Design a protein around this ligand. Structure first.
Ligand SMILES: C[C@@H](NC(=O)O[C@@H]1CC[C@H](c2cc(NC(=O)c3cnccn3)n[nH]2)C1)C1CC1
Lengths: 274, 298
């Protein structure tokens, strides 16, 4: 079912169905690392975690990080036999493409080379960005994990005016649910579940099945498998508590929740799988 | 890149040049947007990455098709469907005789169909002007040049300010609104609608303040009743002169009653009240061009 209200600018069922049909064009494979026998699932987590730190340093949006994550996973599904030293180049080039797509004033190319501490030249990044975009058939507009959370938070706080395009919801609980998703995205097994299911399951853990279904459209049976998998990650966040909303220099406070943050999530990811 | 023979240069922008080309085997003509990557310090331009990814998911009869993306010799070739004229030159060629009213209606109907498709796919065009609307020899008109376009989220966040060419720029942009979405494209289309009718630009300003005052002199100086929140906008001033709204029988003399009504709703000041592309298609101005489909109520 569709959780969107009536839309003045289109058939609500049409918009939602385009969004749903989008997730059929955009395939993911939780086992794509079997195409690269020399890689481990932990290397992906360390790379993604590094990209998250890079985003916070340059105050890049959460959407930019998750585009880079999605570009990375989908590009790997098209490739074979990749080694450790090529990972930092593929990641940072994914982030380069992502920043150019999403930021009003993205960082320059040499800054993306600068953060690799010289392991990636600007010319290497430009070569890699073309390889990535060509191998992805220039399909560079997925509905990221975090984009679904954005939808779910609007619907949860829909007034009677039913205005769905002007953002309105507490920034504090948004960044708390994003924190659970940032952890789960480090585990490659998350790709078993569609991005919209992943975001709805994180929201459920911070509220209820009734709110989850109201704002996501999915029934409890659709997300039960995801929720049971997210179980260890959710409790790790609960044991340590949730983070506070930050202020960023030069960032309007009504956009402050949209900036990617970084925390020591790798040790918390290790405090699971048991 | 071998079967294509460049035939004529047709355009030039910041990141590339557009050529008409012709396949020597099939006789098929296309438009080539060439991007020399050797000159680009930031790699593939953001505007090119955006346009390609957007158009690969926007397949519609009233949107100029992206056919192929070819990378060769430090260059990037975007291969497009070819159309032989833009609406700007068609309006100038028609300036003495006028575009016939059934053709204005058909062109506007098609433009609203293409815009409605963009908006349902959560894409803003943000640069609708007659030079970006292409026509063929079979009565079709199509949206083109998506280099300034942007996908919007549900809900949106703050996007690039001061978008849209000046004459077609909505008043909420000129007044510095923090958020915007689909209403900016409808305003541009309403400006273009009136321009087809009068063969003159509706609001030909030479600065941001001159543009806003040209709008005010025609549609009246807006206030809180007609546009809630207008007096709280960053570029609003209490010192704006008070002009009275002009009768549309003088703004668009040739337009009949249904046309005047549709134009008024496309030029509503309040972006929340401005008619949507989908609703405009249902307007009685097109009641003869289209018939409604039955609607399930479930
Ligand atoms: C320069 C263009 N920039 C752009 O981005 O256009 C897209 C890429 C190329 C596509 C295209 C252009 C075209 N023909 C003409 O423009 C033309 C031909 N003869 C006379 C007058 N005009 N057919 N198809 C769409 C703007 C017109 C939109």
């Amino acid at each position: 079912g569709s959780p969107l209200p009536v839309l003045s600018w289109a058939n609500r069922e049409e918009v939602w169905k385009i969004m749903l049909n989008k997730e059929k064009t955009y395939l993911r494979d939780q086992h794509f690392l079997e195409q690269h026998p020399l890689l481990q699932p932990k290397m992906r987590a360390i790379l993604l975690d590094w990209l998250m730190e890079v985003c916070e340093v340059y105050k890049l949006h959460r959407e930019t990080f998750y585009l880079a994550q999605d570009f990375f996973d989908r590009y790997m599904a098209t490739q074979e036999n990749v080694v450790k030293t090529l990972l930092q180049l593929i990641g940072i080039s994914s982030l380069f493409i992502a920043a150019k797509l999403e930021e009003i004033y993205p960082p320059k190319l040499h800054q993306f080379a600068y953060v690799t501490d010289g392991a990636c030249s600007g010319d290497e990044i430009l070569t890699m960005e073309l390889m990535i975009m060509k191998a992805l058939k220039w399909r560079l507009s997925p509905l990221t994990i975090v984009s679904w959370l954005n939808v779910y938070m609007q619907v949860a706080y829909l007034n009677d005016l039913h205005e769905v395009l002007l953002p309105q919801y507490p920034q504090q609980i948004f960044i708390q649910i994003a924190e659970l998703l940032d952890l789960c995205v480090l585990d490659v097994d998350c790709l078993e579940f569609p991005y919209g299911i992943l975001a709805a399951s994180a929201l459920y853990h911070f509220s209820s099945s009734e709110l989850m279904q109201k704002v996501s459209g999915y029934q409890w049976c659709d997300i039960e498998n995801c929720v049971k998998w997210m179980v260890p990650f959710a409790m790790v966040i609960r044991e340590t508590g949730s983070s506070k909303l930050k202020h960023f220099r030069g960032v309007a406070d009504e956009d402050a929740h949209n900036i990617q943050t970084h925390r020591d999530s790798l040790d918390l990811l290790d405090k699971a799988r048991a | 890149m071998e079967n294509f023979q460049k035939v004529e240069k047709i355009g030039e922008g910041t990141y590339g040049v557009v050529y008409k080309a012709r396949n020597k085997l099939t006789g098929e003509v296309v438009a080539l947007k060439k991007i020399r990557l050797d000159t680009e310090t930031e790699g593939v331009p953001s505007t090119a990455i955006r346009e390609i990814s957007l158009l690969k998911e926007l397949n519609h009869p009233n949107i100029v098709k992206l056919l192929d993306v070819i990378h060769t010799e430090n260059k990037l070739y975007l291969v497009f469907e070819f159309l032989h004229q833009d609406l700007k030159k068609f309006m100038d060629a028609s300036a003495l005789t006028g575009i016939p009213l059934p053709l204005i209606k058909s062109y506007l109907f098609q433009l609203l169909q293409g815009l409605a498709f963009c908006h349902s796919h959560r894409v803003l065009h943000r640069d609708l002007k007659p030079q970006n609307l292409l026509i063929n020899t079979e009565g079709a008109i199509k949206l083109a040049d998506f280099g300034l376009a942007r996908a919007f989220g549900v809900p949106v966040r703050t996007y690039t300010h001061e978008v849209v060419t000046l004459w077609y720029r909505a008043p909420e942009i000129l007044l510095g609104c923090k958020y915007y979405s689909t209403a900016v494209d409808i305003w541009s289309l309403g400006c273009i609608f009136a321009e087809m009718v009068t063969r003159r630009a509706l609001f030909p300003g030479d600065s941001e303040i001159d543009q806003l005052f040209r709008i005010f002199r025609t549609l009246g100086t807006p206030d809180e009743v007609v546009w809630p929140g207008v007096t709280s906008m960053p570029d609003y001033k209490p010192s704006f002169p008070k002009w009275a709204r002009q009768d549309f029988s003088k703004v668009v003399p040739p337009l009949d009653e249904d046309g005047r009504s549709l134009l008024s709703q496309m030029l509503h000041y309040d972006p929340n009240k401005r008619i949507s592309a989908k609703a405009a298609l249902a307007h009685p101005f097109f009641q003869d061009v289209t018939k409604p489909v039955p609607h399930l109520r479930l």
